Amino acid sequence: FNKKADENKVKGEAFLTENKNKPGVVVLPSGLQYKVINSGNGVKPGKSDTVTVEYTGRLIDGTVFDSTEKTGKPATFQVSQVIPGWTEALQLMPAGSTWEIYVPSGLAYGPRSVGGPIGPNETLIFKIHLISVKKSS
Secondary structure, three states: OHHHHHHHHHHHHHHHHHHOOOOOOOOOOOOOEEEEEEOOOOOOOOOOOEEEEEEEEEOOOOOEEEEOOOOOOOEEEEHHHOOHHHHHHHOOOOOOOEEEEEOOHHHOOOOOOOOOOOOOOOOOEEEEEEEEEOOOO
C-alpha cells in the first residue's frame, strides 16, 4: 500500500523539481509556484471572491482524475472554499487572468494519508482559466 504512496512522493517531488525550469516560477505566501500566461486584465475581491472558471486536473499518475470542461458544465466556486494553497493563489487571480498552479501535497492536505482532492504524496497540476468575477464586477 505505502509502496505506491511513496512511489508518488518521488514521482511528484521530481516533477516539481524539474518544473522549476518553467519561466515565471513565483512562490506565494502559502508556498505555491506557477507559470504566468496572462495576469491581470480584470478586477476582483479578496479570498471572499466568487468566480466562474473551467479547469482540467490530472494526477502525477499521468491520468485525469476529473475534468469540469469535459463534463460539459463549467466550474463555479469561491477561492476561500478550496484547500489552503489554492485559497492563496486564487486570491491573487484577477478576472480574465490565466495561471497554472502545481501544489505539492505538503502544501495542501499533506503527503500523509489525509490527501483530500490531491492524492497522498501526489503532485498535481491545475490549469485555471478565469473568465470573470461575480458577473464581471
